[PDB]
């Protein structure tokens, strides 16, 4: 996260860290959407151009963490994965269309002050909140700059506005799709912030004024550099893909 700030303890209790088992390595962010399902980006699991093709046997998650340099006794929880599910029409070869994956925990996690699921959007919330200029919130342990420090100890948080699709489209020569949206400040708005390398798979959330619940509207997916003027971060559009999400959970919930 670039130009963010330290999270407060328990500020993002759905935050999940995805690790490679061996060698142990933090790969990606992720989010807790029930006591046994974790949402992340497909490219965190499958990206052939980088020779990446992880199965559930290769990975684990850590849940409830705030600071990644000390074990947080009686707070953090560690879980293996029973199965992973990648969107069947995920497009790694060009534009990361449908960059979404689900991971089933090997055993359900108990909720606590530090571990609690985020909501997925319903039709009402998506229609009401997914508007240009409305702000959401991105969290992660990724790079503090595009290019001494580099990686933060404590979870980073930044609030960023959703951007109009024509501005997103004009900002990049990549062919973008309706399954992604972009967010970030415009060059004339005099504020900054972005996700960056290592934040992918983490959540873009919004707080509903209608019921005071936090909803996950996006997944950190890609960008061109980080926090550049006239560039924006791109996020998987969670609600667009919710029928696939529900199909996997409904069919494989056991």
């Amino acid at each position: 996260i670039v130009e963010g700030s330290d999270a407060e303890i328990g500020m993002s209790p759905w935050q999940v860290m995805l690790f490679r088992k061996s060698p142990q390595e933090l790969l990606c962010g992720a989010s807790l959407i029930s006591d046994r399902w974790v949402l992340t980006a497909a490219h965190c699991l499958l990206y052939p151009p980088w020779d990446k093709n992880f199965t559930e046997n290769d990975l684990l998650v850590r849940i409830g963490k705030h600071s990644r340099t000390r074990y947080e006794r009686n707070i953090e929880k560690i879980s293996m994965l029973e199965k992973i599910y990648i969107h069947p029409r995920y497009n790694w070869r060009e534009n990361l269309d449908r960059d979404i994956a689900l991971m089933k925990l090997k055993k359900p996690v108990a909720f606590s002050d530090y571990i609690h699921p985020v909501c997925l959007p319903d039709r009402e919330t998506a229609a009401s909140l997914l508007q240009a200029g409305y702000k959401g919130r991105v969290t992660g342990w990724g790079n503090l700059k595009e290019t001494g420090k580099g990686q933060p100890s404590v979870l980073q948080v930044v609030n960023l506005p959703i951007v109009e699709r024509p501005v997103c489209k004009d900002s990049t020569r990549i062919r973008i799709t309706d399954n992604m949206f972009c967010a970030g400040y415009k060059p004339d708005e005099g504020k900054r912030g972005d996700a960056c390398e290592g934040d992918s798979g983490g959540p873009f959330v919004m707080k509903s004024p209608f019921n005071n619940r936090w909803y996950q509207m996006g997944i950190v997916s890609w960008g061109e550099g980080c926090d550049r003027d006239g560039k924006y971060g791109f996020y998987t559009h969670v609600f667009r893909l919710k029928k696939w999400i529900q199909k996997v959970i409904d069919q494989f919930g056991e």
């Binding site: 407060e8 500020m11 909720f111 606590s112 002050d113 530090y114 409305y134 702000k135 506005p161 005071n212």
Partner: peptide, 29 residues
């Protein structure tokens, strides 16, 4: 249907340091 309500914030009637900036964007953004 407990989702999205944080034990250390919404359930305590406590706001975090920057969530008001999000709420304000529904009026100004």
């Amino acid at each position: 249907a407990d989702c999205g309500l944080r034990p250390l914030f919404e359930k305590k009637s406590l706001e975090d340091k920057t969530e008001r900036e999000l709420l304000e964007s529904y009026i100004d953004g």
